[PDB]
Ligand binder design. Sequence first.
Ligand code: NDP
Ligand code: SF4
Ligand code: SF4
Ligand code: SF4
Ligand code: SF4
Ligand code: FES
Ligand code: ZN
Lengths: 89, 122, 41, 711, 154, 111, 51, 118
Amino acid sequence: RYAFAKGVKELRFLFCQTSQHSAEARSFLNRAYPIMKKHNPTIPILLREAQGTIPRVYARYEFGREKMESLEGLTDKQIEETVAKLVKT
Amino acid sequence: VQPTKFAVTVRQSRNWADAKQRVIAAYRAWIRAAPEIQTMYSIPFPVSHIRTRIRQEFERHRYVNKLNVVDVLLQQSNADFQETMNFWRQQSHVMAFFKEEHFRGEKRLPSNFITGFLEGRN
Amino acid sequence: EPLELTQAFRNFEGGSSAWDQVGPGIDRTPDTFKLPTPKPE
Amino acid sequence: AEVELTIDGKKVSIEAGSALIQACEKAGVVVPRYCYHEKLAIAGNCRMCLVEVERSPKPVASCAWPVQAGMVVKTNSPLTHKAREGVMEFLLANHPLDCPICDQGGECDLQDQSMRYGADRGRFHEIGGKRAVEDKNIGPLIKTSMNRCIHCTRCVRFMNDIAGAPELGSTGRGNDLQIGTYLEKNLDSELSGNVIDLCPVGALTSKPYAFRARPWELKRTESIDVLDGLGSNIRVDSRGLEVMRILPRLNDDVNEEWINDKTRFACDGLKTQRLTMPLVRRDGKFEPATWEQALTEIAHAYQTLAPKENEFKVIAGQLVEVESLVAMKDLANRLGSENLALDFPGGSQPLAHGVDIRSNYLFNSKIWGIEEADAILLVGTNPRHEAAVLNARIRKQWLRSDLEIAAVGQPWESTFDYEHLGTDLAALKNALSGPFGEKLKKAKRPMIIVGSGVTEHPDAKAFYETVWSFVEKNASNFLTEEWCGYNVLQRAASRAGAFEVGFVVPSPEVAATKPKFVWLLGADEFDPADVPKDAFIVYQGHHGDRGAEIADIVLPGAAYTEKAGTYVNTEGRVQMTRAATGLPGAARTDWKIIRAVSEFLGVPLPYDDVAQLRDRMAEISPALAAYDVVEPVALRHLSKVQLVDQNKGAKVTGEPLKKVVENFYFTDVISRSSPTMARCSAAKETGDPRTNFMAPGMEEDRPMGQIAYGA
Amino acid sequence: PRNAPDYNVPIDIATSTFTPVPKNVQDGSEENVVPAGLISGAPMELQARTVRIYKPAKPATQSGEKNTQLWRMDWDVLGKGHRWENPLMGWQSSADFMQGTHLTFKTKEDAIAFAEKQGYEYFVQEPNERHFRPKAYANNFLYSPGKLKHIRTK
Amino acid sequence: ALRRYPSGEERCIACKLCEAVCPAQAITIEAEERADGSRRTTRYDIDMTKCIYCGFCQESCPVDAIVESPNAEYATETREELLYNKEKLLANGDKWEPELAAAIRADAPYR
Amino acid sequence: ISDIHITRTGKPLIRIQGGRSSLGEHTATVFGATGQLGRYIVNRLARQGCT
Amino acid sequence: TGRPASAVMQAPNRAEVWSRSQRPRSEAMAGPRFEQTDFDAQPRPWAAIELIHKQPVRWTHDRIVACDGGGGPHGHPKIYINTDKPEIATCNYCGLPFANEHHRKYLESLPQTSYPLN
Ligand SMILES: NC(=O)C1=CN([C@@H]2O[C@H](COP(=O)(O)OP(=O)(O)OC[C@H]3O[C@@H](n4cnc5c(N)ncnc54)[C@H](OP(=O)(O)O)[C@@H]3O)[C@@H](O)[C@H]2O)C=CC1
Ligand code: SF4
Ligand code: SF4
Ligand code: SF4
Ligand code: SF4
Ligand code: FES
Ligand SMILES: [Zn+2]
């Protein structure tokens, strides 16, 4: 629940609408996104979904650098910690 | 044999051991004939350059794992071999097989993205 | 050399009729090769 | 309650109250027709579809006869054969021998069904001759040859019921009954060119198309229109180098067999003002250059200026595909820039709606949702001029239901009656708290539609907060499993695609930076303040227009008929064009220009093939890989963080909403270069209804004719 | 390498300046697929180009649906070499030997099966279908309890 | 040859029937409205090195515009001289018209 | 080396590189082309679709 | 490549093109291929548009007029032309002008007509 480093240009969350994968990414976004968009209001947090999409998260850094992390088989708490690594330094 | 000089009756291979013998037999006949091919069509290349082309032709199909497809390639090789060793092909046909003798070169595709883009899709 | 046509071939296949013009035709199987049919009652 | 009936001895089931001809189509039985069209009211006047029905003495019109519980229908009996032959004989008795000179020839249902269902020879040899009828001037787009008319009534039914333009009709009686406007007048519908296609005969033909091609010589490419935000499905007919005509193809989800006039007739703009070679300005005059010479000058001028963060600015235009935006977003980020702007007022500023949730900017109830809508509020949009085929969908539901429409914004002459609640943000709040809010609250299938010009309004942050707060307060009406009531309408083909990939300026800090290098990615409607005068301008595009003339380097790109490009329409449907013709001159594919400049700028993009770029698209947004479907938005409720929470505190000016389309005919670069759109603009201004108004042909005050079209 | 273009593919005698660089040429080791494109004699170019597989839409100018019954396989037009104006007569020259060729299939699995077997890149465009709605002649004459809202003319 | 009416107006109205029926694809036609609004051709070429001299165009023409003259003695020095455009064909019709009308006069009952 | 050649006097030549039917864009005069060497320059230009 | 009048005039009886996509003769017969050539020897048929407009208006009292080109089987398919508008009606096949006698005074009033009227 804090603003990310100055490197974070944007966040991208990709997930699906069904229960093929878990609902942990959806529950996590249900909670995380309002407070994450709150504390630092100028960071594009793109939530893009599509049928059959494995959960992932992308973090854009400076000059076009990106890191992706798979959220499959991961509970929301681990999803919460997975994002924490991508955003704190 | 019987119909004309280098005529090979069309037969299926019994097994992969049978097929491999034919493929090696076909290669052996091809690279053996390379000296004759040079002087018979007056090719302006050394037998070394011709024999390399033979291996590459056999290497395009090295990864085939299907017996029926091999039988097709073997039949094509025999047909090409017969029409070469018999003087049925003309120098234009054999010379066209060497990709260097096209006035636009042999590297007929762009080296990378930016050379093809600057020239206009190659 | 690679093929290069001064005038490209013009295919008028797209002018094929938007309606079927022949129909399904007629059945002419002889009776000796059509199955029997159950009589009424 | 699908009843069960017999047609040609084979059983078919269909809903009760359906026309017999609809059951024949379901059963696969072909029935000839002229008056009947699936999208028009049943007429029953041509007599071509007569079939034999058991327990019915007279042969029956299969388009008008209702299906019953147990009817038996014979469509290939002698009685049916005799009916079709006799009706075809009457249709051809007065029909003019004009197929060599008629433009329907080769795509004519009268010729095809005469060959199929009629006799081989005619028996009309009257010394008294045939009926001949005078021609009618009904505007600059529709050439008339009224002898060919067979009186099916399709153009009247379309113009009246569908288009809402009750100026076409029929006068007279008997054999002398004549279709037209009783007094020569321009047909004022942006849907008028649909009568040309609907006409089975060549009585109403396209004036710009007149005599140019035969149907069998045309390559037919199914593609998508990009001059609107709906992504209307179209067929592009081309003859080698030249595109000759645009036709609509059926997509009941988006355009429902129709297209608008600019979509149809702006295709002549594709061949007049085209960018075909790179240009480098020098000593104040443009000069030709090679592609190496132009990319070198981009690389040199970039180094010389050494732009810092967000000093590299990209403005995207209306006709830009997602491949170009993704490749350009990858380029701009590698230069440190997040300054990605759009071609409209406030496009260079962060948008009142965000892009974090797809539902913030999409037409959430789908275009199909209008078919069930109970109550509609239109905020700051003239739908006839921004989404005409969607505007006719609202009229169709309005005609056949108790659907109530109201509008807040500038009044427009509408094809459906609407309640004008006001023109400003004050009026919106009063409406939602007023009688029409009650209509919205007590209605299944409510719709609030926000125009793209509201996004360009200074009070835009207060409009989306006002609208969405209503959506949340009255949810379980607006926000249900089967329904979304909040809608954003895009009049441009590129906006929703840009939103999908985050091609927007994120923060006012990026908006504040004054750019040194500015890349106009097909931008020609940019504000003359988002482009600083002392900046190196690069224009990439297909048309020489406003953007190209003020630029330092002009790079020739590709039009939508010359590329496979990905477009996202107003509802989020991802669609792909198909190239009909190749690139002209030395032009290049738009995304490959960006990829080529990246090697020259020292930041080579990873992708070399378009398949690799299209894999990169799935990483940004996976719905971009699903063509011709609309991926549902899972977290709809999260459209409150950016539409209310971030928009809660916003200054309000109270300025009126505006008109984002001053003139329908001149909207993009393709239509502004179209000689046909020039005639439409001239004829609307001067009221001229003559066919040859600025076209070839004899006119009373022009007895020598003229060769010019468009002048 | 994940859709990378193989700039080192061997050329054949039909490789021209208009031939695109392929991604994936058949080698005869693909699982379960007959490699017809390897033995057909067809140039390398046809494994570099994309075909479209679709049901042709009904023309907007006619009601006949005869040409919508079958599945069509068509080659996409390239950026260069599809057409140009011959300077002598003004005729339209081509370098695309596939420009006037199309294939017809009874089902799209057939079209896909043929395309996989030859090694064409392909894109499948599903047909838009009509949304059924019953139509009745008597709806032209419904009683209007209120303002007419539209005046019908037969 | 391309023929005229007795008034001198072109017989050709750009129907494209001869271009469609041509077994050898020897005919190329372009057309628009003329300055007076008449349906006329702008390009009418016949590649005499593609033409198989079968008379199908003359049979398909609804106005007797395209005809084959009796002339056979027009061998040329270069192949380019055998690419007839509209100017060459209308000049041929002007020169050969009395034969063209006589041949049409004799055989039209059988056509 | 490209689809554009700009001549000394500035003419831009948009060229379609190919064979016999292609558009080389150049118009060349070759004096003394009927000798031993004239056949190799004329051949090279003409087969690129140059006049 | 052309100085003489045969190389510039679109036709002997008309200087100007008569369609927008018509190539002007001056540009068409220009370039290297027209260097050592006789230009009067080139095929230059007369413009049909100029000839048909010398044809006088065929006046009629009947509303509908048949036209088949005048050769019987040697003309064009028979079509029927309406003369009710106050203007010269023209056959869409042969270009022949037709006018009703009801409109003679207004057509005689017109400053210039498409057809001679006499
Ligand atoms: N070949 C060699 O080894 C060398 C040649 N060169 C130069 O190379 C060039 C080409 O050599 P190459 O092709 O072998 O020479 P060739 O002798 O084979 O051809 C010379 C050309 O000059 C033309 N020509 C000669 N005299 C006249 C004249 N009075 N009027 C018009 N045309 C004339 C000839 O036309 P026509 O056939 O009608 O006579 C012919 O086409 C020449 O300039 C030559 O001097 C110089 C050094 C070495
Ligand atoms: S409408 Fe049909 S039948 Fe009538 S002239 Fe035109 S093509 Fe021929
Ligand atoms: S003009 Fe065409 S659409 Fe209108 S009634 Fe006559 S035939 Fe039908
Ligand atoms: S020559 Fe005859 S068939 Fe050919 S376009 Fe002219 S009128 Fe039609
Ligand atoms: S005679 Fe020649 S131009 Fe006429 S149809 Fe036969 S091949 Fe074609
Ligand atoms: S289609 Fe039924 S009467 Fe015309
Ligand atoms: Zn006539």
